[model samples]
Target chain A: SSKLIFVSMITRHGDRAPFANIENANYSWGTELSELTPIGMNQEYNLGLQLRKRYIDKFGLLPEHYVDQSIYVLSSHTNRTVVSAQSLLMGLYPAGTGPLIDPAIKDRFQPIPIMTLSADSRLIQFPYEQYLAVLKKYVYNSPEWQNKTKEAAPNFAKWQQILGNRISGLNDVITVGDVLIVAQAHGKPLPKGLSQEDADQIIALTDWGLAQQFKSQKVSYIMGGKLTNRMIEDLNNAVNGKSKYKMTYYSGHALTLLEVMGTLGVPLDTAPGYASNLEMELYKDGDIYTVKLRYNGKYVKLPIMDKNNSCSLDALNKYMQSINEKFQKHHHHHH
Target chain B: SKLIFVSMITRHGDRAPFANIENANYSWGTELSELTPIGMNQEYNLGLQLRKRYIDKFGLLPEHYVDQSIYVLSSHTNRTVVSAQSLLMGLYPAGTGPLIGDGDPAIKDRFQPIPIMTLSADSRLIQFPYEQYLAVLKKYVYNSPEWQNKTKEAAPNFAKWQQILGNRISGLNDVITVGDVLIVAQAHGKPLPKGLSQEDADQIIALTDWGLAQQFKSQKVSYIMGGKLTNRMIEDLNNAVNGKSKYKMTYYSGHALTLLEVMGTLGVPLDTAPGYASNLEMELYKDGDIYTVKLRYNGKYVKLPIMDKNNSCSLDALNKYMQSINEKFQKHHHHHH
Candidate 1:
């Protein structure tokens, strides 16, 4: 009914564990995997409310503009992202059927948009060699695993024999979902078994693992490489020249979000016990775009400046140049 | 000859009997759950193959004679019937409608118009054994342990495993059947703990009773014995016309081969050892037009009865097994029937 601006806020679903990854020291990989926590659901709902205010009050778009068919949305094939979108939708369009349990929308014929990557796929950018360095330090430092670190990689079987008691089934995929089930089954073992407290701890740890995994370099390449390219091409073909969405939601795991952040040149340092969530809104006006970052619920107005041609450009050069400009601005402000 | 004719068969994906949600625990009463992502991928692949096979092998947009026109059929079982229906959605290319659930009324008349049917076993004849034997003129013969194992081994992999492990495990009824498993899985109440390792937990499940009862009931309804059976269930399926097949295709799901095949043995006691098959390949018959039916892989083979109850010499041995088999159908059929 009124001149409308569609705003989409896509973040990876709030801290659903990374499905499985041993590199993460904070979270036990492959356990406590499911929808976002109460905090995440609240954050997404709040994001929707924020967008509504921004669009209706700031830009003056009517509620009628939220047409089901017109509003094309998508989520990765996972639980957290779907739940995140559901939470967002509940806040935005509460009257409609909230969210179907389907992981991905049934795009029978038309190419429904989901999982768009940036110009670099993470596989190419973040080689495992960099992380291996850090991993080695953690293993050597830990008294539990100190003896077995050296012999682990080349001869995994020998390490298995050595450290089998400390880390059972290290090579096996430790899913968060599977672990939660196990934790619930083995109640309150003094040393190794799960307790209610143990379950909660694992849940927190996974949240941190998920956050760091996303920030890792490999994830960046994937989002930048395959996902973003598709978005660009699809946007080019869209009826409107508007390639940027207000809220680009991703209800995927921590790795996916962090990967997008990595490509966006965010340095995510994940220690053993801490987790971080970075939420951003793409404020697009004609040809210009501004990505506003958020930590927890607070807005982060860093001194970093986003490069002008960042949206339209791709490759390592754009990433390096943008990071440099942002760093310079941050340093200039500090000085 | 111009119309494009397509048919497909597939196994059901993972799901609980009650709630068809993701990663839900396998509980009692949860029968036909929704397809997992893995199952969806399998359907997608099957659809892709079906499309390729029809478009490349047959022709894209071909014309069809009235009888040769496009159609589909599914059994009443939740897992099997749904699998067939879903596969069709992917296989058919342009303008192919959706593959909704079939058993329930919500999608039945509206989404799927294909006349879906469920075959009910006949009780009167299989109930009174003496009259049934006289009615069908079945000969009497006995079944042996060695014969039972030999026959049971022929069922599909899952069914074979049940039989092989039925003995060594404690608490298991010495013999198990396909119907028993389906009944246990599909029953309305809570289901037993299900795992190959936990076979003992399945002992007291209700599916065993239904399976045994159904076998006894089917004995009366043999079409050749002055009773009615589905065309596929009858021995008439074996009698194809000289030039044209009576039915072009035959698709079946479950333990028909053991129940119907053994009963119509013409003159022998039916072997009780035929195990069950969860996911069996379908039988396809193609001719100009007279017949179309799909055969299920209940046992290890595409065994259909020939001569009905009329062939005395053939049914004699099977008669002895069924006549002596109590209502539970344990001894002769080996399984709970």
Candidate 2:
């Protein structure tokens, strides 16, 4: 077994209130839009516990507790992700690690440095600016996408008839359906004139629409290239033993995970569920290096352009090298 | 009785912990630096008090709130803008004024549509001028011989002050800022070290205050820092005196240092502490078209001395006095681009 050199992870933030209310529907729970809830907090905390067990308790790759030099956590500047990172740390380094100064005040929490970049500069966020032109050219204007709209014409008409004036686009369907689903998930009453079966169908159609939206290579490149490039840089650093960072964790969104998975050619059937994590591990054994991917508690073998499933480090680097060339070409065109 | 027009500026309500801390003097439970419940209550009470004076007692403004008749501006941070909203809610409670939205279930509360204007505090034109002045001071002001001599003269006291109040946990040996001292003394209710008396604390704070004022105390520095805000207030006053301004009242939600810098520039120093929610009010009166200017600090109306002699000045006289002070500073000092 090759010794694990570096592990990088990206996790979706836990349950959150709807990012936007397109239907102007009242949130019965009354939590602010886009903020993490207690449920979301607990989910991220549990994720932190799992991470600590895997990286520290089992692999012995990371420090026994939080150390600024050894582990890095970066989050989107949004409140939910920031709070998610904080809660995640609370679970990662539990009560025994603390007893921070000031005897009068007692809390098991230890403050760990978590960096955040502005949304504009964040590589993990979706709808990348560089991809906008490509997206407009291929995805939004493509015949396949235009045809999907026509294909959903029946569902759209039925939803409009039921919703009246409230329905606009696929997003409206997704948002309103999500609200109903959330209410149902929490054992609350469905919105008036909404049945359980109808709500389920709306959710299914939303999922179907999303599959069409993200099923383009060009769109995936635009959305996921920067993230992929970053992962490669981290891997390169580990291979060369350049820095002390053994684990780099990113607390981000489902769209972020989806784009990265799509770019890496990982089979993703649907948007990642809450707190879903994807990790990339680099290993070295006596002058030979290899890479592996893990998600949903399973190791995924790469299908890298007819290369071996257990990709050698050279194969992985070569594949990513071509991606970097293509990305550079697009980068020049972006301006 | 004269028809008075009022323009007041206040600091925001109590908020969560400071954005960055180098020391661990206090542990503010697990809330990551946003507005707190106590802060909401403070701003709401301030709103109720303003409503009492302007709407009910003085009849200076309408009993029913008019959104257009009041201009509310806040720093673009969450705590300040949220504080502004909470204050507005207290001033005009739900169902007390005009309806905002459709009576649908989506509209949870019938709070009147009171708009609060905000701009990013990073902009040079609207927000604090301290950063600009501090830059200039660093390059040309603090390093100047005058400042060097001033610090030389104040060194013994500074050393004694540092020795008395510099007992934070080891490895956290950063100098105590004025804000740090105030928070330690007032917020945490921690008395100065055992030997230090109240008078000693006051003297130490005074010395620190003097140190800040030395580099930042020039008249030009004040104008550069506070002139835009003063001009806005004066414009409102002039419009009210002429019966032309749309708003009868204007409120600025800001910080303690914000008010302190402005008041210090006006030569109307706030002797009392600029605690949380500290306010300074400027009232413009029209007594049969002969307008008079009155200043209020910490709730008490104080006589404003203008031009070193006129304790109470007419509107034109006060305007001319301020202009003369500005011209004098502008003529003598030039901030290097």
Candidate 3:
């Protein structure tokens, strides 16, 4: 019988308040500016419950109760990601069964361990980021990008008038678009002149803008290799019975999901939604170890995936090894 | 009736379980060395206290947290980062919701989220493991005749402690080193090393308190480590007096060392280590013709030896005393640069 061995999950944070404050929105965003809204917490919690049902109840991959070494949870230092991770964890384990630290507060709820990414994306220091040191070029919006996405970008002149401000570029467009979308989701009114379709177009423009970052295979190698490399190491380690974690959840930004998708040769057209999850599941059947990827909740096809959408652990590791070695030599040269 | 500005700092909430016990086995929650839920509640309630004092009763800050309303700064550590975030949630709970008929049944606690910022690891203003302050302090502390005498008085016991409760603890510093872990362990309901009792506990706490006290004991030590932050506080106070300040409160989240150092700079060092969520609060108010500065340490008022007031000091007197300290500090060559 084949059994699930290890799982890795990376999720974009849930519905959050936007960076730009819009006029005529009916509700004041003073308390939640650029922060995860209550709805966002609900989204992440729902994702956690679904994950708990799938992995814990359905597959029995993890224990019914919480165990420290059995799982690792880390998030970006941003408030939204940290809180999203907390919300997700609360759903994953829920109360009464979580860590028992104090009798006074016994199960008001449990506090899960959350680490911020530090060092490099080496992934051991309980954090993530050396990839930024390498990806600084792609991080900034480029002249090359403006040229490529110029035709696709929203008419900034029109939307700027609607939102009552000057939006500098695609990044600004993303923020304003997100604000409109978030406001609508909360049942709040949109800005004076913008409609639902306008918001969709805005999203289409920014998604196109973000999509440009993955055009270079080098982008995947630099942005996604170290994470994939570490995933490969731990997945292989589980195969050899040396790994400590049965599951790992990385609460990260939208860009993180995109880079991983691009690296795996499955470029996503629609942007990853709030609380969107990319899970890499390792399963062992007798002596054979294999891997499969599920985005959100459904299995997907990739170049590396076989006809059954299963990937032999051998081919996945070999592919990841090529990217890992390429990054390490480059990661070493910088250091 | 015209409070214009506020400034404060606090240690993070309860830290996770940490120990290297030889005989005793201890375990903390999944929080590891990070902030626990208990600590989050500690700071959250601290923020709730601020809400009552500043927002509800005093009318110093806005009811809802907004951009440019309050500025927050924390050291690079996640505990401090989350501490600030949790504090803000309690400070500005999304009561009902921001809109009419907005409380949803889904969200727990009806919490409001706010953004906080992190300073770099090397930032000196609230830096941890600060070396410059330590070197200057060690120069004076190791030379302290009083401290050396205290050490002399407790040598055998210290020596015995070095023997029984050893984590390479040679002197008072090591006692503090081992003491913190034991203290953290005991707080989380863990047992201590064998041969150690309650008597051993307090004596360790007593000396560790005394050892940490030396950092704030010297004016030179306080000035070097706490000078820049005090300068920041003073400049804002002056700005407040001039009617040109931005935030209603500037909350600083840091270690006990940070608050103690700043307390000493303001001419009042604590009698002991600042506890979890312990705060050093400064508020500037204009009562008609006069501006007053109020200093509170852990809910108790702080009176500078130079100030004769019972509850507060006149802004000019506070400024004059701070200026004198800075001028005295200028006499020495600076190491902060």
Model 2 Cα lDDT, one tens digit per residue, B58-158: 78877666535677776655556656665765676544543222433111222232445554446443345445645755665566676677556655555
Ranking by lDDT: 3, 2, 1
Lowest lDDT block of 10, candidate 1 chain B: B106-115
Candidates' chain B TM-scores in the order shown: 0.36, 0.75, 0.89
Every candidate's lDDT? 0.36, 0.62, 0.71
**DockQ scores of the candidates:** 0.01, 0.03, 0.15
Candidate 2, residue B152: lDDT: 65
Model 1 residue B54 CA deviation in Å = 29
- For A158-243, candidate 1 gives per-residue lDDT tens digits of 32343232243221212332344333333322223334564454444444444444453443543444443333333333325554
List each model's interface RMSD: 20.0, 13.3, 5.4
Q: Rank the candidates by TM-score, best first.
A: 3, 2, 1
Please list the residue runs of candidate 2 whose C-alpha ends up more than 4 Å from where it truly belongs after superposition: A20-27, A102-105, A126-137, A141-144, A165-172, A238-243, A284-290, A305-315, A327-335, B1-135, B143-145, B150-214, B218-337
Better of 2 and 3 by lDDT: 3
Top model by lDDT, which number?
A: 3
